[PDB]
């Protein structure tokens, strides 16, 4: 239709087609799962390889010891958004010695992403991010979308076929939020959830990437040999 | 500081002291006063340590970009011109530099370009730079010959730096020698003045006024 | 600002076993003219922080406005701002120090010396000094202006090292502070009889005793002095 | 408006086989007044490096903050890899010379183990100009401290007895403990003869086992 | 298709030919397009001469600026790279292809290059640009030999004029020749010289 | 504003059409003066037509009248005054001659004809003025910036009929009052509505007017040569007509 | 600058091939000189980015050359600011932060790497890769032949065999060109003599 | 300090400049050529501050060569001198003035007349039969006034230049290490081995 | 932007606009250069209407065809440059140099906005030489020398006449050839005589009439 090609045009029904197609951009990407307990937050990602001879894309970006994120959709937009988040957290640390609260980071990314959806010439970010962190208020998990919407969550999954993972997370919500004093079972529940989104493929030491942050855990990414114990 | 570089039949001999001073306090006696731009190009820093070190390290990166783009080494004239233009554009800003750009190129032969804070750039066969330059000249001009042997040229540079180290308060430390050959530069080592002086007095019999 | 016109003289502070005590006189002097006597130079920024400022009074009011804006902007989109993720003394001091150093670097300095005193959420006392040049330091006792020379020895006699803080109770520290005010009033020509005192305690919060008087002055020995020499 | 000051501190870096030592007093000064007895100015910088920016305190804080930012960005980009001592030296050189015409009036020292596992000490002037040194004092009492360290650590002007000044005393390695003893005695002398030193001595030791901090009392008068 | 249309514009410019000998490089053009950029290097173009002016002036300014920034004059490689870089930057774009030829400072090896609206440049021993470049290039391929190169200025000028006369109507009034020689010994052949060589080749073309 | 395949500038012709839709305006050169005339329409009987003057002073020696879009004329006029002062009088200490000011106004309108994001001005001007060197002048300036001097001319919806009438009436020996008479007759023949001193307005570039100079005691200064004829002055002539 | 309803944003060149091994990385390019007059030595389809990084390209179009200059500036400024050669993945990220590309090089962090930019600009590390019109046929052979114990000697003949299989003209030291990067030698280009003797080794294997 | 002299002869312009280069307490070089060939028949000699002299000389030479390349003919010495003056005068009010005095000696192949222009660091151009800059004019001008003639041949001009240079050697305190003499005439520019 | 097949739309349409403009004629002599224009209305002010031939400097003049509005911009650009050249160098601009500058200013507007719909003939003498000069320019930004050339709406006809009509010897033959080109193609003609030493003069209506009557007498003779 004639309203699709520009970000600054409402449809006759009031829809922003150019942003909903950015959402389709995440729907193109592979699944990444996130979940939290009161003390630990976990990310689980199914990486992709262009060819049998090719290595996999790193889908987890570490901000620092208390925060990090994963990707779904256009990786370069993830680079841009992640470096902006790094700039904001670094500025907070230099100017206040203050750990940038995860909700503050989420809303900063919301504000930055909203700008592209209102001014002409800009393109909506075709990437959605799951952000986890641990601060003075406990473990956090956020869902970021191109439209700018940012949502705090117990758990979620974004990417292709993530609906099954989200269904499993909704079913087991009352369980994994109770997990206390140990990260192992939380990561196990995360890998069980992500396994719901696999077709003609299975979790393997090369596909899977796991990350975690919490009270006793600075942000660490497990991959390769380290993730073998969870697959 | 004392630094000297003179062309001769075997290439170029570059000699420098090591002392660095801040007022009367001798800050250090092991300052490397030769910046190694590339295996065939050699900078000789004097005056302000920070300015020379930083800007000749940057000149190294410019040289690297030059080989990467044009597949041939930056000429001594070109590198000295870049440095001269840069130092000129900061004239009056407080740069303190005295630099001899010594190098060897197939289409230039052995070449020395003197560059300093005030923007000058001089091609020449013999140069002495630093607070002790006059004392080094007194020996070089009285002993220099084009057809000196490599050993004799090295000894002449060592002795010329030794004279300035003896007579100049700001020019002691140790003598570092470089020989810029047809196929590159050769670092002929470090000589401590506290031993070179006595060795030279014994062998030459000079410094007869010095007790010992 | 290149020169201070109206100034507040001195601020002193010390940390005791459970918190920090800080005091400052209410006089802003226009040169040698004791012009304004109602100035308040202790700036509460919460139940856990109070900021003492010296030097140019106009720059002090600017800094107070900056602190008010900090408090205002911290509460934006911060549902927890009133109990956690609230502004600690450390955050206030770090922001102030960054601003002061930046102003210094631009050759447009705030002619103030600032003591940020408070207690962190973990209960640890916070007490740091920052001046126009951006120079910062911490100590069991801090003072500004003539306090750094007159008052600071008196406070150090009470808490000379970090080991003495738990030994120092509220009453001992308050007596030391009041005696330092009396001495500064005696010997500082820019000082005033009226001063404000603020106590931040990890248990009982911020107490802010305003318009206190210097008392127990000793003058009766002056009747025996008979001029220079004879 | 004079934008500079002098907070009267001293730092000392010594390197040898198996270790590197960076020591500095905790006294903080303004004119003839003691600002604080314990303000650390030698910092454990992570990555098995120790840093100090002695001199004008505000510029020291600013430069240290800038270097922390730069090393953290290096970690962001280069996949959280360990930063080498020479890379840190070049980073600090570029930080310092970035303000050539409005310098940081701080004499910086970074100490650590180089890529070969041998101790390394890099020292900077306010403009840049880093030189790797076996030992390098700095600050107010540099002139008092350093000659004695030359004499003891390098045996300058010392000759084997009976050789009538022809054979120098060989430069055998000092162990870490012996370097601590030399540092303590040198700082005791600097305290005793220099008014700006004597509150407290803090020493950071760098070795493959990691950074190790030791604190010693000084006269404090 | 903007650069494609620019190339179509190139296809309507007058033809220019270059030949490299052992000690000479000679440029020929149908009826001076061959213009001197620096004392030792020249530039020839085919296409919109209106758009060629900006390229020529930028090249000249860059050559002098290089001589001012570095003591050494520009090499033919450097000038060709700059021409390509500028010609990219306007991608309306310039509808012109170019040849760059000459000698490097204190050099002895003649250089010849070609540059394209794409910004592509490559070294050539002999090359043509313009409307009938295909026929002239085919003619050159069967008359030039890498393993038997021209030896003298006479051979170079003869080969250039013979290549141009393949399609040119009347050489004396319809071609021009410039000879570039080491150490800025560049010269342009006058009417009597070019006519001498043209008649020399004419005496042979009529015989077969 | 770009060339069409036929070589014409596309949107300029539309500006000319807008001018043709404007009310009639006139200009006539006598040997000793210049007359510029125009009828002023009204939006309603309640509007104070005396508030707006279609004729306006550019310099004390130069005056302008227009046909077309009035707001465009107003902004072009204050632009013209600004350039006449800043660009010429600020430098040379004298007002620009009719030729120079006409050139600057033509440049102002031509910039819109050769710049994107702006439409051309929808007004044609008749700029009457006088010079010590060029003498009296009358110029017509079109939306395209093309300007040509005229002995007598007319613009607006009555252009052709007024021009054919002036061609008959004009001669090389007109005095200023004869020019005023001819202008009154021509504009009366073109006004379809009521015709009196309040619907018509006149201005003249004639002899010096020291009575309008506003001060006395400087023999060198001469006073404006441009002056509008008041409603009573025009009524007097229409009664004598 | 606009997404399609499917979430995506709105091959004919010459072939380049590369192999990565525990011992080194080898690159190869079809030259395909368009005329015997063209200076074959002037066809630089492989260029150095840094003393341990080289880039093989389908064609050195000016858009590629600007990217080469940006990558070279990134490497040189990294050396200037950090006193260390740029890591291959960091260089690829910097270029991405700025045509089919095979960025390949060596470093002590990840050893020997080869990178190929997918059409969306996302670099993927590869064990073996081919680009250009020959990639469609080359990929199957690369999948067949690569093994973890592949030696550099075998990798050279592998890349040469791919070139022979896909090229339009009989291999010689002029119409095709090789380059490799090694920990000790750095990035280097095989001279015509070495290429020639490798072609004769290929012929001997065929014989 | 520098010596730069110029004499306009019936046929040629004779420019002489000192060979010494002094920096502080020491003479660095004793064979420096303080001249640049602006064009085949135009020659410029400069004196002044160390970096400024050569930087301005090369900037002017590059600009003159660019103009000659663009227009495909040699600029007249008048045009060259006017450009140099405009560059000098334009600089004194800028942030970085050029403390450079220049003598431009050229042969106008179109007028077929030698031309000598003296331009000071402020930008004061004046055409002269004989010119000198700085203190070098304080000794030579009286001798040149005494002995100069319009109709001299280049050899009498060289004899007069010898007189001027040896007068400078006699009375003037500095050691300028001799002069390097170049003749500008119909046939171009050449250097005299020992005038 | 280029058209497919290598054309350029706006330059072609500016050429059309030039072709529909009034004519400008030029003839260069052995000792002078003569430019002629046909003025091509009964109330238009003849006394002060500008002549199409315009001075760009003391020694060089410009004549134009096409859009009159753009001619003013082009002429002022040329005048400003001609005076700037004397600001930088003592010598006034050469005719070649001036035609080159006007070609450049015309070109720059085609690649940068619309092209100028103007074509021009340029005539003059070098500042201290005496050879005649005549040059032409068009919207594309290209120039060439000529012996006698014309631009405008009659060009397709009068151009072959001038080709039909060894340069002329003396100014009488130059003005005769110009006026005969204007009259032979079908007295209201501007004639401007350009002579070295900056003598630039326009022939009066009575001088034009003298030449025209002589040439009509010759035409009657046949």
From Swiss-Prot, chain A:
Alphabetized Gene3D superfamilies for the sequence: Glutamine Phosphoribosylpyrophosphate, subunit 1, domain 1
Pfam family, one: Proteasome
Phosphoserine sites (modified residues): 11
Biological processes annotated in GO: proteasomal ubiquitin-independent protein catabolic process; proteasome-mediated ubiquitin-dependent protein catabolic process
Family matches, as SUPFAM superfamilies: N-terminal nucleophile aminohydrolases (Ntn hydrolases) (SSF56235)
Compartment annotation: Cytoplasm; Nucleus
Keyword Nucleus assigned: yes
Main subcellular location of this protein, as a coarse class: cytoplasm
Superkingdom classification of source: Eukaryota
Cross-link (Glycyl lysine isopeptide (Lys-Gly) (interchain with G-Cter in ubiquitin)): 188
Gene Ontology CC annotation, any one: proteasome storage granule
Record key words, sorted: Cytoplasm, Isopeptide bond, Nucleus, Phosphoprotein, Proteasome, Ubl conjugation
Quaternary structure, from the entry: The 26S proteasome consists of a 20S proteasome core and two 19S regulatory subunits. The 20S proteasome core is composed of 28 subunits that are arranged in four stacked rings, resulting in a barrel-shaped structure. The two end rings are each formed by seven alpha subunits, and the two central rings are each formed by seven beta subunits. The catalytic chamber with the active sites is on the inside of the barrel.
Miscellaneous field: Present with 7210 molecules/cell in log phase SD medium.
Family to which this protein belongs: Belongs to the peptidase T1A family.
Name of the protein described by the UniProt record: Proteasome subunit alpha type-6
Species the sequence originates in: Saccharomyces cerevisiae (strain ATCC 204508 / S288c) (Baker's yeast)
Gene name as annotated: PRE5
Swiss-Prot record, chain D:
Gene Ontology cellular component terms for the protein in this record: cytosol; nucleus; proteasome complex; proteasome core complex, beta-subunit complex
Superkingdom, natural source: Eukaryota
Location of this chain's protein in the cell: Cytoplasm; Nucleus
GO-annotated biological processes: proteasomal ubiquitin-independent protein catabolic process; proteasome-mediated ubiquitin-dependent protein catabolic process
Alphabetical keyword list: Cytoplasm, Nucleus, Proteasome
Annotated Pfam families: Proteasome
InterPro entries recorded: Ntn_hydrolases_N, Proteasome_bsu_CS, Proteasome_sua/b, Proteasome_suB-type
CDD domains membership: proteasome_beta_type_1
Keyword Lipid metabolism tagged: no
Task of the protein: Non-catalytic component of the proteasome which degrades poly-ubiquitinated proteins in the cytoplasm and in the nucleus. It is essential for the regulated turnover of proteins and for the removal of misfolded proteins. The proteasome is a multicatalytic proteinase complex that is characterized by its ability to cleave peptides with Arg, Phe, Tyr, Leu, and Glu adjacent to the leaving group at neutral or slightly basic pH. It has an ATP-dependent proteolytic activity.
Family assignment from sequence similarity: Belongs to the peptidase T1B family.
Name of the protein: Proteasome subunit beta type-6
Source taxonomy: Eukaryota, Fungi, Dikarya, Ascomycota, Saccharomycotina
Underlying gene: PRE7
From Swiss-Prot, chain E:
The UniProt record lists the keyword Phosphoprotein: yes
Localization annotation: Cytoplasm; Nucleus
Gene3D superfamilies membership: Glutamine Phosphoribosylpyrophosphate, subunit 1, domain 1 (3.60.20.10)
Gene Ontology process terms (BP): proteasomal ubiquitin-independent protein catabolic process; proteasome-mediated ubiquitin-dependent protein catabolic process
Additional notes on this entry: Present with 16800 molecules/cell in log phase SD medium.
UniProt protein name: Proteasome subunit alpha type-4
Entry superkingdom: Eukaryota
Curated annotation (Swiss-Prot), chain F:
UniProt record, GO biological process: proteasomal ubiquitin-independent protein catabolic process; proteasome-mediated ubiquitin-dependent protein catabolic process
UniProt keyword Nucleus present: yes
Main location: cytoplasm
One CC-aspect GO term: proteasome complex
Keywords: Cytoplasm, Isopeptide bond, Nucleus, Proteasome, Ubl conjugation
Glycyl lysine isopeptide (Lys-Gly) (interchain with G-Cter in ubiquitin) crosslink location in chain: 99
Subcellular localization(s) per the UniProt record: Cytoplasm; Nucleus
Subunit structure, interactors included: The 26S proteasome consists of a 20S proteasome core and two 19S regulatory subunits. The 20S proteasome core is composed of 28 subunits that are arranged in four stacked rings, resulting in a barrel-shaped structure. The two end rings are each formed by seven alpha subunits, and the two central rings are each formed by seven beta subunits. The catalytic chamber with the active sites is on the inside of the barrel.
Family indicated by similarity: Belongs to the peptidase T1A family.
Task of the protein: The proteasome degrades poly-ubiquitinated proteins in the cytoplasm and in the nucleus. It is essential for the regulated turnover of proteins and for the removal of misfolded proteins. The proteasome is a multicatalytic proteinase complex that is characterized by its ability to cleave peptides with Arg, Phe, Tyr, Leu, and Glu adjacent to the leaving group at neutral or slightly basic pH. It has an ATP-dependent proteolytic activity.
Note: Present with 7060 molecules/cell in log phase SD medium.
Name of the protein: Proteasome subunit alpha type-2
Gene encoding the protein: PRE8
């Amino acid at each position: 239709n004639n309203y699709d090609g520009d970000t600054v045009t409402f449809s006759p029904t009031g829809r922003l087609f150019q942003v909903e197609y950015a959402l389709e951009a995440i729907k193109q990407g592979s699944v990444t799962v996130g979940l939290r307990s009161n003390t630990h937050a976990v990310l689980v990602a199914l990486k992709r390889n262009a060819d049998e001879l090719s290595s996999y894309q790193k889908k987890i970006i570490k901000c620092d010891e208390h925060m990090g994120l994963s990707l779904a959709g256009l990786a370069p937009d993830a680079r841009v958004l992640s470096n902006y988040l790094r700039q904001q957290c670094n500025y907070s640390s230099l100017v206040f010695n203050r750990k940038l609260a995860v909700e503050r980071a989420g809303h900063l990314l919301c504000d930055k992403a909203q700008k592209n959806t209102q001014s002409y010439g800009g393109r909506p970010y075709g990437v959605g991010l799951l952000i986890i962190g641990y601060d003075k208020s406990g473990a956090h998990l956020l869902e970021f979308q191109p439209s700018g919407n940012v949502t705090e969550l117990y758990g979620t999954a974004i990417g292709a076929r993530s609906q099954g993972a989200k269904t499993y997370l909704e079913r087991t919500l009352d369980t994994f939020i109770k997990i206390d004093g140990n990260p192992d079972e939380l990561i196990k529940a995360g890998v069980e959830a992500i396994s719901q989104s696999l077709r003609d493929e299975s979790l393997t030491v090369d596909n899977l990437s796991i990350a975690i942050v919490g009270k006793d855990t600075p942000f660490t990414i497990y991959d390769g040999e380290a993730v073998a114990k969870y697959i | 500081t004392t630094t000297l570089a003179f062309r001769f039949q075997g290439g170029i001999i570059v000699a420098v002291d090591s002392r660095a001073t801040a007022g009367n306090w001798v800050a250090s006696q092991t300052v490397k006063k030769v910046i190694e731009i590339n295996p065939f190009l050699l900078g000789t820093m004097a005056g302000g340590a920070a300015d020379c070190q930083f800007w000749e390290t940057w000149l190294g990166s410019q040289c690297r970009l030059h080989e990467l783009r044009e597949k041939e080494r930056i000429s001594v004239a070109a590198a000295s011109k870049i440095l001269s233009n840069l130092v000129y554009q900061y004239k009056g800003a407080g740069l303190s530099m005295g630099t001899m750009i010594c190098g060897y190129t197939r289409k230039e032969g052995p070449t020395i370009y003197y560059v300093d804070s005030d923007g000058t750039r001089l091609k020449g066969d013999i140069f002495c730079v630093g607070s002790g330059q006059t004392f080094a000249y007194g020996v070089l001009d009285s002993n220099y010959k084009w057809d000196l042997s490599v050993e004799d040229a090295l000894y002449l540079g060592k002795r010329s730096i030794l004279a300035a180290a003896h007579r100049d308060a700001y020019s002691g430390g140790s003598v570092n020698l470089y020989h810029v050959t047809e196929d590159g530069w050769i670092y002929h080592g470090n000589h401590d003045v506290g031993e070179l002086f006595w060795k030279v007095k014994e062998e030459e019999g000079s410094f007869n006024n010095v007790i010992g | 600002t290149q020169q201070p016109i109206v100034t507040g003289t001195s601020v002193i502070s010390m940390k005791y076993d459970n918190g920090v005590i800080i005091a400052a006189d209410n006089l802003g002097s226009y040169g040698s003219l004791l012009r304004f006597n109602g100035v308040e130079r202790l700036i509460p920024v919460g139940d856990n922080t109070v900021v003492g400022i010296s030097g140019d009074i106009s720059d002090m009011q600017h800094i107070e406005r900056l602190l008010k804006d900090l408090v205002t902007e911290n509460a934006y989109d911060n549902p927890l701002a009133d109990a956690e993720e609230a502004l600690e003394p450390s955050y206030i001091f770090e922001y102030l120090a960054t601003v002061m150093y930046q102003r210094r670097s631009k050759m447009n300095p705030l002619w103030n010396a600032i003591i940020v005193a408070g207690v962190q959420s973990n209960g640890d006392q916070f007490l740091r000094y920052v001046n126009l040049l951006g120079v910062t330091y911490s100590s069991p006792t801090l003072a500004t202006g003539f306090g750094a020379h007159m008052a600071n020895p008196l406070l150090r006699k009470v808490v000379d090292r970090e080991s003495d803080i738990p030994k120092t109770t509220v009453q001992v520290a308050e007596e030391a502070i009041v005696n330092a005010m009396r001495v500064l009033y005696y010997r500082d020509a820019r000082s005033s009889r009226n001063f404000s005192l603020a106590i931040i305690d990890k248990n009982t919060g911020l107490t802010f005793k305003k318009n206190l008087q210097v008392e127990n002055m000793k003058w009766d020995f002056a009747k025996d002095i008979k001029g220079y020499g004879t | 408006f004079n934008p500079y000051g002098d907070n009267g501190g001293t730092i000392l870096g010594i390197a040898g086989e198996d270790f590197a030592v960076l020591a500095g007093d905790t006294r903080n000064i303004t004119d003839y007044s003691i600002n604080s007895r314990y303000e650390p100015k030698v910092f454990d910088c992570g990555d098995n490096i120790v840093m100090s920016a002695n001199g004008f305190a505000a510029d020291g804080d600013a430069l240290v903050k800038r270097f922390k930012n730069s090393v953290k960005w290096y970690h962001f980009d280069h996949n959280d890899k360990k930063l080498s001592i020479n890379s840190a030296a070049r980073n600090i050189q570029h930080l310092l010379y970035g303000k050539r015409f409005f310098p940081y009036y701080v004499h910086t020292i970074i100490a650590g183990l180089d890529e070969d596992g041998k101790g390394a000490v890099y020292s900077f002037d306010p403009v840049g100009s880093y030189e790797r040194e076996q030992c390098r004092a700095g600050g107010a009492a540099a002139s008092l401290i350093m000659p004695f360290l030359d004499n003891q650590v390098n045996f300058k002007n010392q000759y084997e007895p009976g050789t009538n000044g022809k054979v120098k005393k060989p430069l055998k390695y000092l162990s870490v403990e012996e370097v601590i003893k030399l540092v303590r005695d040198s700082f005791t002398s600097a305290t005793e003869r220099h008014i700006q030193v004597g509150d407290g001595l803090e020493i950071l030791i760098v070795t493959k086992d990691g950074v190790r901090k030791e604190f010693y009392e000084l006269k404090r008068d | 298709f903007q650069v494609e249309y620019a190339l179509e514009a190139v296809k309507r410019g007058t033809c220019a030919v270059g030949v490299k000998g052992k000690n000479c490089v000679v440029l020929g053009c149908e009826r001076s397009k061959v213009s001197k950029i620096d004392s030792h290097v020249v530039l020839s173009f085919s296409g919109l001469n209106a758009d060629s002016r900006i390229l020529i002036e930028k090249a000249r300014v860059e050559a002098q600026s290089h001589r001012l920034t570095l003591e050494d004059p520009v090499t033919v490689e450097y000038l060709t790279r700059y021409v390509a870089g500028v010609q990219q930057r306007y991608t309306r774009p310039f509808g012109v292809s170019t040849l760059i030829a000459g000698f490097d400072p204190r050099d002895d090896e003649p250089k010849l290059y070609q540059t394209e609206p794409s910004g592509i440049y490559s070294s050539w021993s002999a090359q043509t640009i313009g409307r009938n470049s295909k026929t002239v290039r085919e003619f050159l391929e069967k008359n030039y030999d890498r393993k038997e190169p021209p030896a003298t200025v006479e051979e170079c000028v003869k080969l250039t004029v013979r290549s141009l006369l393949e399609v040119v109507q009347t050489g004396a009034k319809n071609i021009e020749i410039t000879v570039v020689k080491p150490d800025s010994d560049i010269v342009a052949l006058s009417s009597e010289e070019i006519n001498q060589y043209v008649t020399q080749i004419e005496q042979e073309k009529q015989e077969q | 504003t770009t060339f069409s395949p036929s070589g014409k500038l596309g949107q300029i012709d539309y500006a000319l059409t807008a001018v043709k839709q404007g009310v009639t305006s006139l200009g006539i050169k006598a040997t000793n003066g210049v007359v510029i005339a125009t009828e002023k329409k009204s939006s309603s009987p309640l509007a104070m037509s005396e508030t707006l003057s279609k004729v306006s002073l550019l310099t004390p020696d130069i005056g302008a009248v227009y046909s077309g879009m009035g707001p465009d004329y107003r902004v072009l006029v204050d632009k013209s005054r600004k350039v006449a002062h800043t660009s010429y009088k600020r430098i040379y200490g004298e007002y620009p001659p009719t030729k120079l000011l006409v050139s600057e106004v033509a440049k102002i309108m031509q910039e819109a004809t050769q710049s994107g994001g702006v439409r051309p001005f929808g007004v044609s001007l008749l700029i009457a003025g006088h010079d010590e060197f060029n003498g009296f002048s009358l110029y017509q300036v079109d939306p395209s910036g093309s300007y040509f001097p005229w002995k007598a001319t007319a613009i607006g919806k009555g252009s052709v009929a007024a021009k054919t009438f002036l061609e008959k009436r004009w001669n090389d020996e007109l005095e200023l009052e004869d020019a005023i008479h001819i202008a009154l007759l021509t504009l009366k023949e073109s006004v379809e509505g009521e015709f009196n001193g309040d619907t018509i307005e006149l201005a003249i570039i004639g002899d010096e007017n020291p009575d309008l100079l506003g001060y006395t005691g400087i023999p060198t200064d001469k006073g404006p040569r441009f002056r509008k004829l008041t409603s009573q002055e025009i009524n007097d002539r229409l009664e004598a007509l | 600058s606009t997404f399609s309803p499917e979430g995506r944003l709105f091959k004919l060149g010459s072939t380049a091939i590369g192999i990565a091994t525990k011992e080194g990385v080898v690159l190869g390019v079809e030259k395909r000189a368009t005329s015997p007059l063209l200076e074959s030595d002037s066809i630089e389809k492989i260029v150095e980015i840094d003393r341990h990084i080289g880039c093989a390209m389908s064609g050195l179009t000016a858009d590629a050359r600007s990217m080469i200059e940006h990558a070279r500036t990134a490497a040189v400024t990294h050396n200037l600011y950090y006193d260390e050669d740029i890591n291959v993945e960091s260089l690829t990220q910097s270029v991405c932060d700025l045509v089919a590309l095979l960025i390949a090089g060596h470093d002590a962090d990840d050893g020997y790497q080869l990178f190929h930019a997918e059409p969306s600009g996302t670099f993927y590390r590869y064990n073996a890769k081919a680009i250009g019109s020959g990639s469609e046929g080359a990929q199957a052979e690369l999948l067949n032949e690569w093994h973890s114990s592949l030696t550099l000697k075998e990798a050279e003949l592998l890349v040469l065999k791919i070139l022979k299989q896909v090229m339009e003209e009989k291999l010689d030291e002029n119409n095709a060109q090789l380059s490799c990067i090694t920990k000790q030698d750095g990035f280097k280009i095989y001279d015509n003599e070495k290429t020639a003797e490798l072609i004769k080794e290929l012929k001997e294997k065929e014989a | 300090m520098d010596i730069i002299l110029g004499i306009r002869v019936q046929d040629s312009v004779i420019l002489a400049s000192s060979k010494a280069v002094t920096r502080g307490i020491s003479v660095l070089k004793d064979s420096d050529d303080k001249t640049r060939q602006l064009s085949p028949h135009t020659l410029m000699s400069f004196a002044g501050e160390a970096g400024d002299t050569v930087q301005f000389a090369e900037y002017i030479q590059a600009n003159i060569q660019l103009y000659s390349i663009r227009e495909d003919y040699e600029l007249s010495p008048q045009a060259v001198s006017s450009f140099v003056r405009q560059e000098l005068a334009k600089s004194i009010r800028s942030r970085r003035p050029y403390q450079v005095n220049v003598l431009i000696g050229g042969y106008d192949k179109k007028k077929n007349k030698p031309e000598l222009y003296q331009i000071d660091y402020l930008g004061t151009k004046v055409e002269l039969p004989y010119g000198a800059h700085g203190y070098s004019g304080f000794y030579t001008f009286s001798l040149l006034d005494h002995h100069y003639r319009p109709d001299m041949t280049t050899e009498e001009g060289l004899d007069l230049l010898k007189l001027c240079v040896q007068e400078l050697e006699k009375r003037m305190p500095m050691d300028f290490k001799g002069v390097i003499v170049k003749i500008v005439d119909k046939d171009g520019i050449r250097q005299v081995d020992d005038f």
